Every structure is written in structure tokens, then in C-alpha cells.
Amino acid sequence: NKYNSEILNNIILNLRYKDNNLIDLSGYGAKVEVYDGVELNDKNQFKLTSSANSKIRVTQNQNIIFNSVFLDFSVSFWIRIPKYKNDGIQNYIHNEYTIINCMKNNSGWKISIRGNRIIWTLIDINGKTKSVFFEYNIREDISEYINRWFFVTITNNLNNAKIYINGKLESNTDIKDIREVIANGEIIFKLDGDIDRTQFIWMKYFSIFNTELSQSNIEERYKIQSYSEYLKDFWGNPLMYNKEYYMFNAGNKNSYIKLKKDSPVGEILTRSKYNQNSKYINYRDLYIGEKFIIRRKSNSQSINDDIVRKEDYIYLDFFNLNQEWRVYTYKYFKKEEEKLFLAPISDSDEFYNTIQIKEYDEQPTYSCQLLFKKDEESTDEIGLIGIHRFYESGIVFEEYKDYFCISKWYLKEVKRKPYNLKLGCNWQFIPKDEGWTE
């Protein structure tokens, strides 16, 4: 409809990937210099490292007779900040480093990071300062932010500086007392401060607007830049085939899958937690439970790797001590839910092995759903993969226990609006990542 141009309104700088480089497609033609230390890929993601040559310099229109200033302006971008090093806590919490700086005659703005806090700073013509920040908890079991791509938007008008995270307002600072801010300085993208040589930042879709973006407009941009045909992993990157993944359940965040001893089923256990005793941090381990791997079903030709897309037909396997086993459901079960069947790769006609990976959520998410159908062409849906607490009435036992299950119930629950985010049928895949050490 070319009606999707709405999120381009008032844009004055739009950094985009093009021919192994970054260029401003705003139409105002800013000069962009990307140095050799900046890693760039087609997916619009760029990485800033500790290297001196890891920087980006953007030059804007020069102001000859008068000073160029902003009244209302906004800054948009996605970012992924790696988790702190357990052995480098002090440096993480105390050393602030600039990631992006835009100033001329000591006036302008900048974005800096101090540990788990992202900071927006304004400096007027007098040197007067004002800051608004977003800090995410580092003592939480499962963080929605640490080492995961998330959307940032900072808007400014003459009275308030607001920080929006993932389309929602998180912080606000009264800036009425701050004066004019020089806006045409060079914009330097580069890590600057006393940082660990291993520190890095990933950023994507950096843009500036010469207006105060509305929440409504920010939400739409959030939705549009979150949209993709491929599914994503726990970190927000594209989901792939033939890649080792630990499985996470949105509905039961502190649980993981473990092949139950002496059984062909997966039991659900509680995640181990940070063992040391730092008073600053806490988290549940993520690299635990069975190591799963997604294999392409339909047309399996020399599968070495690749991207998983919505509606793809797959095989959900996992390694049982070097051997690659598979996840199945019995073609027959009468309970509302039953235990999934874990076993070697076979063609048995006693159970279903084909899964279709879906996305029932209409809003941005990194979760997906796993559905077993009679077959690819059939519309008879068997059930969705999830977690359910069964009742093990032993002759003396009398105990309830969580199992990796399939459920007929979910099939109707995923239909309810708004889409249920708390469902135990929402999964996320976690691959080892340099940004997360435990």
C-alpha cells in the first residue's frame, strides 16, 4: 500500500546495510564512515568491539552562521548487551562506557552503558546535564533483556526525555531546566571507557527523528522491525536447523527437560542457579537439560544448517550421549494429555514423528509452538508440545510430577484472544552464545 511509510515520517537519519557497508537512507545523505573493526552482516546487525578501529563516524550538515539545534527529536535502535562476566562483576557495575556520542562545542547527546544500565544524556549550550536511564535486573532467574535483542526508543521535547523499551514507556526525566542542545555534531559509534578487552555491543536499525515520536508510532515500528518469516531463538536471532539448542519454556521459566532414568519420557526438573555468592547477581543456568537439535523434515537434502521458518515441517531430536534420538507422540492416547515418547530414530508406525513449528502469537515474541498433526496435508491436529504436571498414584507414592507432554487442550487455548503468553506450549531455543557465560 506504500502506506507502510508511516514509520519513516520525520526521519532524518536512517542507518541501513548496503553492499558490505552502512549508509544513510533518510534522503538527507549523511556521510557515513565504517571502520574495519566493525563487523557487519546482511541482517542489519553491527557489532562494536574493544578494538580502536571498531567505530562508525557519521558527519551531518555544517552550520555556518547560526547554530543547529533540536527542539523535539527521537532516537531509535535495537541493541543486545552481553551478560556480565561472573569473575568481572566489579568492573561491570562501576565502569561506565560511551557507545554513541554526538556533540559539537561540548553540547549534544550520548548513550552510555554502566553494567546493566543504559543511559541517555543531554548536554546544553551551557554544559548543563540531564540523564534518563533504563536498568534491567541482574538478580532475576530468567531475564528478558540480558544478551537478548531488545528495542530502544528515546524521545525528547522541551520538557521531558523518555525511554521506551519494546514499545512501552519505562523511564522519564524532567528536562524543562535544560537549554539548547547542538544537534549537528559528528555521531561517533565506538565503545569508549575502561572496558574489558572482551566487551562488545550489537546494534541494529539506528535512526534519528526530528520529532517526538508517539508511543503509538513506536509500537508500530516495534512490530514492523520484529516481523520476519523466520522464527527466532532465545537471544532474538534467527532460529536454525542442525544447531544445538537447550530448550526453554515460557510458561515454566525455571524448568528444563531431562530424559527420565529408566524411562522413554522426559521429566521436568528445576534449573540450577548461580552458585557463587556475589551480592550483585542471580540467575538460573541456561545450558542445561537435553541438547536438542532441529532437523528438516520435508525434502532433506544434505542438511548442513539453514534457517527455520514459520510452518516448516521438522523433526525434533536430541543427543543421548552422542546418539541422536527423536521426540515422538503415540498416535493413540485417551487422556487430555500424555507423555511425549523419547527414543532412537525409527520408522515405527506406532507413533507420529513429524512436527510443524508454528507461531500463534500475534504480538512480537521469540517463542514458537510445536504441533503434531496426522500428516502434512491433513488438518487433523493431534496436539501441541508442552509441560504438564501428572499425578503418579503409586501403591504408596501419592505424588504429582511434571513431564514433557503433548496436549489436546492447548489446541483450543491457543485460539483464545489475546494469545496466551503464559501457556506451557510456548518454547524458546537457547544456543551457546559468547554473550552468555555461566
CA distance 438 to 413: 35
What letters, b where the CB count within 10 A reaches 16 and e where it falls short, cover 398-411?
eeeebbbbbbbebe
CA distance 271 to 406: 22
- The length of the chain in residues reads 438
How many degrees, rounded to 5, is the angle at CA 259 between CA 253 and CA 262? Answer: 145
The answer to whether 438 is annotated as binding is: no
Write the burial class of residue 94 (CB in 10 Å: 0-12 exposed, 13-18 middle, 19+ buried). exposed
Query: H helices of 103-231, where?
Result: 215-226
The answer to whether 388 is annotated as binding is: yes
CA distance 32 to 23: 6
Element (H, E) at 267: strand 266-270
The answer to whether 94 is annotated as binding is: no
CA distance 35 to 33: 6
SS3 220: helix
**Structural domains in the chain plus CATH codes:** 1-233 (2.60.120.200), 234-438 (2.80.10.50)
CA distance 161 to 174: 7
101: alpha, beta or left? (left if phi > 0; alpha if psi -120 to 50):
beta
Cβ distance 250 to 368 under 8 Å?
no
Element (H, E) at 297: none
Nearest to 96 by CA among 193, 202, 200, 198: 193
DSSP 426: -
How distant, in Å, are the alpha carbons of 89, 95, 100, 278, 326 from that of 92? Answer: 5, 6, 18, 13, 41
**Resolution in Å, one decimal place:** 2.0
CA distance 370 to 314: 9
Cβ distance 93 to 114 under 8 Å?
yes
CA distance 189 to 34: 9
Tracing cell 505424588 back to the chain, one arrives at: 399
CA atoms within a 13 Å half-sphere pointing along the CA-CB vector of 47: 17
Tracing cell 555461566 back to the chain, one arrives at: 438
**Beta-ladder partners of 156:** 73, 161
Cis peptide upstream of residue 418 (ω within 30 degrees of 0): yes
How distant, in Å, are the alpha carbons of 84, 90, 239, 292 from that of 242? Answer: 28, 38, 10, 9
The answer to whether 336 is annotated as binding is: yes
The answer to whether 337 is annotated as binding is: yes
